[PDB]
Structures are given as C-alpha cells and as structure tokens.
C-alpha cells in the first residue's frame, strides 16, 4: 500500500474504504517498463468528511470508558476511488493475519509484530465495489458493514453471508418511484439507469412495478462515467427522437456529469427529472449553470443525523497534526491550490478553515456520515455485548463465550446477527436477515435561492415506509415547482385523451398508454370524452353533425295538415259542393236518387283516406273501391237498353270480396323504414293481390260493361247526346284508372297515396260533370 | 491451507487449480462453534490424471537441460472442487510474496524463507472459477493460463489482462452448432444450458446464430448441479408439454447428472441430444443404463495428444512415494475402498495399478491433459526466451532485459504476449490478443460396443475451423445412428409440410418454423406441396375436387348436334316437306306463287338460327322476322275486299328497319358467363329495343291488320269457310307470338333460343296448314 492511509494502532483494527476521488485516470499499461498504480484525478470532500465522521466516533469510543473500557481501537483505512482494482488492492492487506494458517513460511517473525487481525471493516459506497469485496470476506466470515451500498442483490445471504447495512434497501424506493407517477397521474415515461449493480437491478424492479401499475416505458438506457461520447449523443438523439417529459434517472453522482455537461451544451429543455437518492443531493451536479435545464428535480434522501462536536472536529484540522491521515496533507494542498514542501505556490499550513466555499463543511445535514457514525457504534455495541458476555449464556454452543483478548470474526458476526439496542436519539437499530433496517425518505424539489442562485432543496413532502401500499406516500403538492417555476403539472401521456366525438381505438403493438381515437359513424353519440367505444342510437334518433348525443328524429310522412294536400282537399270539397248543387237542381226541378247518393259516397270516400294513418284510417281504402263500385250503378241503369234496383247483384259481390279481404289483407297502417335518418312513414301493407283483384273485379269490370253496352250507342245521339256524354265519361274514368297504376307502382311515402287520392277524386269529378252539367245546363 | 497439496521446491513456483471432486458438500454454517472448510464428496480421476499430466511435464523440464538449464522448478498445487470459495482460499496463498509491499510488518523474517513469488499459474477448469480468480491476478499482472475455461467473456482484455488459453473459444462451436442443424435441415428446437458463465453466454451466441439462420427456438432452460428437484420435474414437464426431437445441451459434466437420473427414472425416450464438448466425452454420464434414453449423441471434442512415457508414469504411483502429493494417499484409499493407517479394511499399498476399471487410466486419448502438458511447456518456452534474452534486444524499453534470478510476472506476461514457437509434433503455438489458439473439432456419435455395452464414441466426421462459413463443416453422414440405432434422420420441424391442395398460411405470433396450411377455394390448383399461396385459374378451367391442377372447362351451350334439338329440326324439315307437297299440289292442279315462296322462306328462316352461334349465325335472326313479314303478304292479299304486288310497301319498311338495326344492334354472337364452372354460352347481345320494335312493327301489325279486316268476315263463310280458316290462322299466329314472349324473358342459354325457334316453327306450320290443307283436301 501507499503512505496514503489512515492508521492508528490499538487492540482491534477496523479499517475502511472511501472514495477520495470520483474518477480514476485510465492509462493503458504497456508492460515495457515496471507497471504501477494509477493516480485518481478527481476529489470528494463528502468522502473526506466521511473519513472525519469515522475517526471522530472512533475517538469517542476510545475516550468513553462506558463504551468498552480498557480497550484502544486500531484502524487501517484506505482510499477506494471508485475502482474495484484499488478496492481489492486494499482489502488483500485486510485479509492478512487470518492468512497465517495459509502463509506460514514466516516462522521466525510470525508473532514479531503479533498483529491482531482486522476483526470487522466498514464497507464501501459503490454497489459494484461492495459486491467485489464481499466475496472475499464471506470466506473468512469477517463481518463487513456498508453504509451506502443499496442494491437488492446483496440482500441474498447465500453468497453474501458477512454483510450488513446501515441503509435501507431499494425495493421501497422503486415502490415510491411507481407511486409518485401514480399520484402525478402519468402512463408514459422513459428511464435512464447506470450500467452496474446499482442502476440495473433497481431499474428492473421498477420495470416490474411499471408493468404492475400498467405504465408503459418509453426507453431504458445505461450510462457510466466512462461512457462513449457518441453513445451519449446517441441517447440524447434518442431522447429528442421521442417524447416523455418525465425521466427516471437512477444513478450515482459523477456518472451523470458527462451526460449533464453534454446536455447543457445540447440545450434540451422541458424534460423534468426524477432522482434516486444516490444523486438527489449531488452538489457537483447541483450547479446554477445547469439549473436552466435541471430544476423541478424530485428525489429522495435519508433523514438527517446529529453528532455533537462534529463541526468543531471538522475544523480541528491541520496537516502537521495528521499523524493518522495520509490524505490530509493532500487535502490541505488541494483546498489551498498550493504546494507545501518540507506554479502552485507554497502553503503556510495556518490558513482559516472556514474561509472558502467547500462541501466538506458547507453542508446542511448529516445522512451518510450519520450512517457511518452509527455503523461503527453498532460494531462497538455488538462488541460491548461480547464484553459483557453473560457467564455461560453467550451465543455459542452452551452459551460458552470466549475471551475478549482472543476474539474471532465469526463470533463477532454471530453477536452481530442478534444485536438489539437503540440509538443515541432513541431508535432501536435491530438487524433482520436482510442485514439492514428501513427508514423513511424525504421528498424534495431542487428549488433556487433566488437572490444567490444556490440550488436549494425544499422538502415538498416525504415517503413513509412503515405503512402499507397505497398508504405509505404523502406529498403536499403545494410547493412543487415543475420545471423549477411552473406551478402547473405538465403532460406526459403518449397519446392525447381525445374529445367526445371520437371513440378511443387501439393501435397494434403499442399498449394503452398510447392509443388512437376514431369517430364512429352513423349514430355515434359518444358522450364521454374518454370511453374507448361508442353506442348506436335507439329508433327515434339519428346522429348529430358533430356526432354528439343523437336527437334528430325520423320523418313525418303523414300529410295531414300539409299545405300541398290541403288545397287538394279543398278542391275535393268544392267538387262535393258542386255535386250537392247538382243534386239540389235534380231535387228542385233509381238514377235520380241512388246514382246521385252513391256518387256522393264515391266523392266522400277518399276524404276518409287522408291524414296520419291508423287502423280504421288504413281500412278506409276499401270503401274507396266500394263506393266507386256503387257509383257505377248509373253506368248499368242508364243504358239505351234500359229490376232497376238490382245493383245489389254486384254490390254484394264487392262487399263479400271486401269482407274476405278484411281478414285476408292487413287493415292496419304499416310504418315502414325506408331511409335512415327520416324514415317514418305509413303504407298499410296489403296482403298479396287482394286490392288488385277487387279493383279488377269492380272498376274495370263495370267500366268495360258500360263500354261494351255503349260501343254501339256511341254512334247514336239521344237525349241531347247523353250516350256520347256517358261514353266520354266511361273513357275518362278508364283513362284515370289506367294512369293511376304506374304512379302508384313507382313511388313511396307521401308521394304515393296522394296520387291514388287525386286520381279517384279526378275520375269522380269528371264522370259527375259529364253527366250532370250536360244534363242540367240545357 | 490443508495438507492436501502438491508441492516440491524449486527456483520458481508455479502451482495449479484442479477439481479432485465434482460436487462439494453444502452444509450450512451456524456460527455457534468454530467454522471450518467443507469436505467435498465426489471424485474425478480425470482431474487426478490432469495432476499427473502437470507434474510429468514439470519433471521433464527439470530433467531436460536443453529446456532451462541450471533451474529447478517449484510448484504449490491445490484442489478446487468446483467452488470459487476454495478457489479463492487457494489463490490468496498464491498472491503471497507480492504482498510484501503491502504487508511489511514481518521485518524480522521478511527474507527468512526468502520465497520466490509464484510467477505464473496454471488456471482452472470451470468458467466461473476462472473468472473469479482472474480479477485478482489482473491486478498484479501475474499471467494465468487456463486450459478448459472456454467462454467468450474472457476474450475481453480490458478486465482480464493476464489471461491466456490453450483451448479455442466458443464462437466456432456455436457456429458449428448452427451448421449441424442446418445440414441436418431443421427449424424447431429447444435448448438447455447451464446457469453460469459457461452455458449462458454461449447459448446467447447460439440464439444469435439461430435467428441468423431463421431457426425458431422452442425453449431455453438453465440447470446446475444444485438445481431444485421440483424445477427439474418442472422442466421435464416442459419438455413433455412441448415437441422438438433435438436438444442442444450446452453444459459441463456433473450438472446434468441429477437431471439425467431423473429422466431415466421418468423414462422419456425419442428425444435426441446435441453435446457441447464439456460433456461430449463424459464417462460418468456415458453409462449403459442410460443408453436407452441417450444415444445418437452428437458432440465435439478436441484432437488427441501424445505424451511419451505417460502411461508408465501414471502407473508410477505409490502412496508412500507421494512426497509432493497430498491427494495421492486419499486417491489410493478411494480406489481400493479401504483405510490405510500409519468397515473399510486396511490397505497394503502394494496392489496392482492396472487391476481395476478406472477412467484414471482406461482412457483412449489425451485432450485436456495434452492442453496442460503443452501449457506448462509454453510457460517454460516464454521463460526460455527470457533465458536467452538477446543482449539489449528484449521486449522492454530499449530491449533492456533483466536477470533470471529476479524475474517479474509483468516481464513474463510481456514475453508471453509475443511467443512464437512450435509443438513437439510441429504446430506453431502462437498467441493473438484473444489469448488462445484455435483448432478443429471431431464430431462423434455415442455408439455402443454391442457385446460389452460400453458406450463407444465413433467419429462420424469433424468440423474444420480454418475454412470460412458455409465451408468449414463436413460430416460423413453414413455412420450416424439416430436414437442409437435408427438409420433414418428423424423429424423435428414444428408444423408439418402440408400437401399440395392446402396453401401454407401463417399463424399470428408463431414464426415460419410452425405455420398453418389452408386449402384455398374456387380455382385453387395449388401444384407445389410447400408454396405458401396458390393461384387462380385462367378462363377455360375450373378446379378439381381435390383442388389440384384445374382442367374442368366451361359449358357447351350451343345445341348444334344435340339430341333434344335434332328431333325438332327434323320436325321442321317435315313441315318444310309438307309445304313442298302443298306447293306441288298448287302447281300441278301472287297468292299462288309469292305467298307460298315467302311462307317457304319463313319456314327456312329459323333453320339458319340453329347451331353454335357466330357473327352471320347471330345476324340470321333478323331474317326470321323479315321472312315472316314477307309470308304475312297472304293476310293482306286474300282479304274479302281484294296492285296485288304492293307488298313492297311493308317489305321495304321492314328491310329498312333491319338495315338500321344491322348497324344499331350487335350482329355478333355474345358469349356470356353466367355460371362459374360451366358458363360458356351465346346470346347475341342485341342493342336496347331494336328487335322488339321490329317485331311490333311487322308481326303484330300485319296480324292486327288481318284481324281488323276479318272481324267482319269471321261471320261470313265464303270459299268453303276460307275466311274462318284465315281468322283461325291469324288467331293462332297471334297466340304463338304472345306465348313466345315470357318464355324468352324468363330463360337463359340453350333454354331460351330454342323456345323462339320452336314458336316460330309452330306458328308457321299452323298458318300454312290452316290455309293449304283446308284448301287442298276438299
Ligand atoms: C394519462 O393517462 C392516464 C391513464 O393512461 C389517465 O389516468 C386515468 O384518468 C382517469 C380520469 O382522469 C381515471 O378515471 C382513470 O382511472 C385513470 N387511469 C387509471 C389506470 O387509473 C390520466 O388521466 C391521463 N392524464 C392526462 C393529463 O392525459
Ligand atoms: C416515518 O414516517 C411516519 C409517517 O407515517 C412517521 O410516523 C409519525 O409518528 C409520529 C410519532 O408516533 C406521529 O405523531 C405521526 O402522526 C406519524 N405520522 C403519520 C402517521 O403520518 C414516523 O415517525 C417516521 N419515522 C420512523 C422512524 O418511523
Ligand atoms: C423443415 O423446415 C425447413 C424450413 O423450415 C425445411 O427446409 C427447406 O427445405 C426446402 C426443401 O426441402 C428447401 O427448398 C428450403 O430452401 C428449405 N428452407 C430453407 C430456409 O433453406 C425442411 O425441408 C423441413 N424438413 C422437414 C422434414 O419437414
Ligand atoms: C483442421 O482441419 C482441416 C480440414 O479442412 C485440415 O486440413 C487438411 O490439411 C491436410 C494437410 O495440408 C490436407 O492434406 C487435407 O486435405 C486438409 N483437409 C481438408 C482440406 O479437408 C487440418 O489439417 C486440420 N488441422 C489443423 C491444425 O489445421
Ligand atoms: N447506493 C449507491 C452508493 C451511493 C449512495 N449515495 C451516494 C452518493 C454519492 C456516490 C455514491 C452513493 C450504490 O449502491 O452504489
Ligand atoms: N469449458 C468448461 C470447462 C470444461 C471443459 N471440459 C470439461 C470437462 C469436465 C468438466 C468441465 C469442463 C467451462 O468453461 O466451464
Ligand atoms: C436553450 O433553450 C432555451 C429555451 O427557449 C432558449 O431560451 C436558450 O436561448 C437556448 N440556448 C441556447 C444556447 O441554445
Ligand atoms: C455444554 O458445553 C460444552 C462446551 O461448551 C459442550 O461441549 C456441550 O455439548 C454443551 N452441552 C449442551 C447440552 O449444550
Ligand atoms: C429487544 O427487541 C424488542 C423488540 O420488540 C424490544 O421490545 C426490546 O426493548 C429490545 N430490548 C432492548 C434491551 O432494547
Ligand atoms: C420406457 O420407455 C420404453 C419405450 O417404449 C419402454 O419400452 C419401456 O418399457 C419404458 N420403461 C419404463 C420403466 O417405463
Ligand atoms: C535506452 O535504455 C535506457 C535504459 O534501458 C532508457 O532509459 C532509454 O530511454 C532508452 N533509449 C531509447 C532510445 O530507447
Ligand atoms: C514466427 O511466426 C511466423 C508466422 O508466419 C512464422 O512464419 C515463423 O516461422 C515464426 N518463427 C519461428 C522461429 O517459429
């Protein structure tokens, strides 16, 4: 190892593993000369104060005699600047005295220094570093306690048997990560993890919860602090080639830094951020030059801790007082940008500690330092439980304890598996077989000190864990500033929630977070804006133009009080009045009475076939044939071959045909539906041929009888050409009955029945005129 | 470490890592007492002879002075019974003297033993074990040479910098694994890998090649030697719940053993096997009790090797000669099932070596032992190149070599990166930056010694690697015995290659290895048995009943020589003969000549409208109207009001109407298509109303003229009721022309034209009879 160490002697050595530099240099060895270790060129003041938080509690235990009397404590602490290489290079020296059973060819000085073996060890930050170092110490059962390693792979106790945490596991952070977008009500998001044991398994767990809550994922990407610049530009083009305003960033501190500088050069705005706790308080990331594109940044953190005298101990520093710190002189030079020696100028070693801005001392809270501060205490308190072994009631076979002068790491781990004691601020730190405890999380926003631009972290709520699901989370939303200032919550669903008129269809391949919306046709009336399917209307309605609630009814094919038909009804009334005047002339000055009365009935027949149709109004078309067949009695009575009341021989035949037809054909108005929107009509639905047979048996039978009896009398003037007038009236009635047929066969609705009505009225008026006017006016 | 070691002193220590036991015991430590290492209860004679192959070549280098004179060689070899735990427990003692710069608190005896550091080390078998141990030695650049670790993760030189192989990599085995089922012509298979660094990445590479060659995968499963018995039953139920006769097993030796015993209890047969080379020669697996369900087992292996004196050295064994072997006495007791000491009886230490069946000595070839035997030599030959450093032309800065008494592992690795020398049997072992070489593979079958039942491994070909793709592989298939004895190659496609009549459709979700097949309808004629889609027929064909090549033609609606129409044509000929007899009587004993001639033309008119239709045969229906209008001249000439040659006044009108119609309507036979299979007809397609207008203007005009001229003469007998006969003939012709209309309007094809033909013939025959017979017979 180097001189870069932290070591004081003592009865039991502890040692620790700490990131004094974020990034390592990455030189390529070439084997032409003697290879050597690599200097790691970055810094972490938070790591240096983590060292201070270690050694302060160390000296607390040494000074306090209530905590392990007659026992000075050693340590041999090394820097692991985020490489498993130097982590292994350190921990091989940790597995040293236990290798005396393996390396025993040093017999002449095998107990010269007589070193106590490093009994336990404070772990390391990065999950990859801890998983690398855990496999070695699982062999010797040397208990290793991490403080920041927070991946669920280490919860396995098959491989990692000698591993404990003073930090909660990651499943609850994945749970709250699902629940925050649940409460924030989104379905469409893309995430970015780190390509190691911290990012990948936790983002896999978040993928589990995302498909539990049916939240579709845009993308899942991986970066590191050694990522390729083309790959960073590639994933940035992936971001700009897609759309999800929220992003689950689930990485450590310095791994985002190249991507972050690249993005602030790329000047992408609008996308907002979700933070894992490994970078949710990242001072090197939290910079006001980056607060244009970061901000509104929501994350989690641990609760604060309290250490007495600690700020004073942090300013109890001096480079020629670093008898147990190799890193302190380099820290002094690096803070003061100079070159002390026993470009960069000299250093006086006497400057003010609280003079310059540094995250070493300009903190607000104690979280991971607090975890270390209680971690070394929990080691010491399990050790204290060994120190007061109950005489015969230890944690061994038969409770048979051993001495404290010869204590072994497996005994230490056995007592560490059952350690039931409480905090200095009164919290029972108690280990399950997951090797940790669990606490709550704060929930912050990256706000801004507006006059200074220092990115402040306002608590906007928290996440309890001690409740159950659907119950653990509370956010006061009333201090959230989305995109740093916008009070309104933004939009991150993929497809828009469409309006009322278009029902929400589905695209193949893409799930429910991004759909399509299609306006259904022809009776759509889709009322709700976000129902996936619409309904079809009932009978009395048709769709709106904007396909809203269908109210447009059907047709009104009745022509009852229609102005086109009312004038024809008035003309029929005038014809009836002319017939009344002719009968009044015939009365004042069988053919005289009944031929006039049956003609009046044939005139009044079609007037009972007008209006909105019904049962009786439908069956009243049979009297339009019967009264015309009765009015044809003059055509048989007034022939030149003129017992006269024997018109019953055809009247009863027509009546019997109608009595059969009343049960054969339908005497009921038939409301058909020909069109779609306006289709309400009435057409009476006669049976198959009943009306045609009755018409052929009455009308064109009596007219043909009159024509066959007057074919000889047409060339015969008698009673002032009354035979000529009768033949002309018979021809006119036959012409009207012939012309009414195709206009009934080629029509519909209110265009069909009016033709038959007007034709019957016209034929009656013509025959009545050609008889009565030529009779009377002379 | 234990006494279970292999150690002789020497100037440079080497050491190795070897599986003396397949499985370890898996006791759970409970920390109530002193924990300790676990005894591993299995054995591997192949591992023991691998130790022998190490130490024999070691003593060869020591005895040979041409190979490194004045240099005895140490070793410190340990057993790694397939656990990374004991592998690490070994290799911590390997990184020992290099830790003097780290552990320097042993100053009073830091050079007492003055141990030379273990300069290089022969690696280990299992890929997980080698990847575990490689990360440690990559730090110190101690070159480690494996011999069996064959995963492509170790081809990376970023992490594993100090790693070399004397075994080819796995990409070519995955390539040949794709090519063997390519040549064996399958598309549907399910695989089983081992759940570690050997199985998983290679089976991932095979998945790449499977989707390259478009070979769909049934399943990809993972087992170990610590698999769950319910999981083994679960994957066996997965096998029985699916179907693929070939199985890519891609694991080590003992990991299949629980699954294999479970399967031979489960008694699944029919499935055949593909072997990776890690178990393709697995003697503990190759058992005759298992050769019922295994057999036909195809795999790969390395070529054999040759070591002189080696069989004698293997039988140069004695337990009280094991001065550098801790495992040898246990090997002696384990072979002889006894208990030597200085139930199981005593051991004499003097039994015959070649007395019992054991895979220690009952081998056939040298493959991995050969790899070790050349591996230690390649270490020694790079060391020899260091020994004759060219004075100033080494592999350093300026070629500046160092001494052999103080040699470092980075110098050794530098010379190992450039080592260009040849085998004892003359093959240039030369390392690229993949840290290996590449050789061919044999391709075997697990045959049977039929009288002894020992599963013999007949070579059934090989796999060259030095060619390119599509070129590297040759199999003589003529010794393959599928399922151990069946000469025919079996079937493992998912869906069957269907017959000709059903075109191959596609199922959603499942790719081309498993499809559907559907018989297309209505002109299918799908000729090829394995074309995905069919075609539709040309016009002159319709489909077969079994939907094969469509040959069934269309209809023959001509009725030219039809027996139903030939009798009617003969009746028309008899009517023409009767007309000829009547004209002969009228000649022997205008109406006399032309009314007979035009009647003969009207008789012969329809006879030119019979047969298969054509242009002139289609236009010959106009003469059927013209000659009938000419034959109606008697109806105007023979009236009772009887200049006579003025029939031209209507003949020219009919001719001008026909001359207009010849250009108006189509004078061409119209082959319609009404049906589907048999639809070939002829219907002449007249224009819109031309034939109807010409018929109304000629036929029912002349007949109505005759009727209006004879309505008074019907009650007038003259010339023996010739007026009555003429009126009856006119009524008959009008009745025939009226009856021919609906039978033409409601028919088709050969049912329509024959009606008009027979009606014209009947009307002509009736009119000619009613004139001529009543004229002549009196
Ligand atoms: C974004 O989409 C989600 C679902 O994809 C919407 O959540 C639904 O909201 C409606 C009313 O807002 C609720 O009745 C549903 O129960 C919610 N879905 C689920 C699964 O609970 C969310 O409203 C959408 N937000 C925006 C702004 O479009
Ligand atoms: C973790 O969060 C919970 C929040 O549910 C805290 O519970 C509070 O406990 C105090 C003391 O009993 C109560 O007065 C509060 O009403 C609780 N808050 C609730 C119910 O919302 C709890 O203190 C937090 N810390 C720990 C260590 O459990
Ligand atoms: C199993 O299926 C494969 C393909 O899924 C078949 O291989 C095809 O065979 C035909 C003729 O046998 C060739 O014309 C094709 O070129 C082959 N396909 C490819 C992709 O090359 C194979 O014949 C099938 N075997 C059985 C027994 O069904
Ligand atoms: C690897 O396999 C190839 C097979 O392609 C072997 O090549 C043979 O080489 C000999 C010697 O030159 C020729 O006589 C043969 O005709 C080759 N076989 C062919 C072309 O099929 C080769 O020997 C094998 N071994 C090595 C180490 O390359
Ligand atoms: N939990 C992280 C370590 C970590 C937590 N907080 C951090 C802050 C900075 C750097 C690393 C961390 C891991 O598993 O790797
Ligand atoms: N290649 C194997 C090791 C191996 C090769 N052949 C073997 C035979 C038996 C056991 C193991 C092996 C691995 O990577 O793990
Ligand atoms: C970055 O985007 C913001 C958003 O409008 C814009 O105001 C600013 O000018 C941009 N800066 C650069 C350098 O493109
Ligand atoms: C009592 O203790 C001794 C030594 O600690 C041990 O050997 C013995 O098994 C124990 N007996 C019981 C019953 O625990
Ligand atoms: C031991 O743990 C239990 C858990 O409920 C707790 O009640 C008890 O107070 C603990 N004992 C001590 C001494 O703290
Ligand atoms: C195993 O299957 C074979 C295949 O037919 C059969 O002959 C044999 O009897 C079976 N054995 C058992 C134990 O089921
Ligand atoms: C020559 O060798 C010395 C020592 O080996 C070295 O320092 C020097 O750089 C070398 N010069 C060249 C040009 O290689
Ligand atoms: C070195 O390698 C080359 C590679 O082609 C070979 O030709 C040559 O023979 C090798 N040298 C020796 C000494 O074997």
Numbering used by the authors:
A (entry chain A), B (entry chain B): 21 to 362, 391 to 637, 649 to 701, 724 to 859
Article passage:
The purified, Ca2+-free CaSR (EGTA-treated) protein samples were supplemented with excess L-Trp (10 mM) and subjected to cryo-EM. After extensive 3D classification, only one model with an overall resolution of 4.4 Å was obtained, showing a conformational homogeneity of CaSR in the presence of L-Trp. The 4.4 Å map allowed us to build a structural model of CaSR in complex with L-Trp (designated as CaSRTrp). In each subunit of dimeric CaSRTrp, one L-Trp molecule was clearly assigned according to the density in the map, which is located at the cleft between LB1 and LB2 of the VFT domain. In particular, structural alignment of a single subunit of CaSRTrp with that of CaSRIcc gave an RMSD value of 0.62 Å, and structural alignment of the single VFT domain derived from CaSRTrp and CaSRIcc gave an RMSD value of 0.41 Å. The structure of CaSRTrp illustrates that the binding of L-Trp induces a conformational conversion of the VFT domain from open to closed, pushing CaSR into an intermediate active state. The L-Trp-bound closed-closed conformation is therefore considered to be an intermediate state of CaSR during its activation. However, L-Trp is not able to induce TMD rotation and thus not able to activate the receptor.
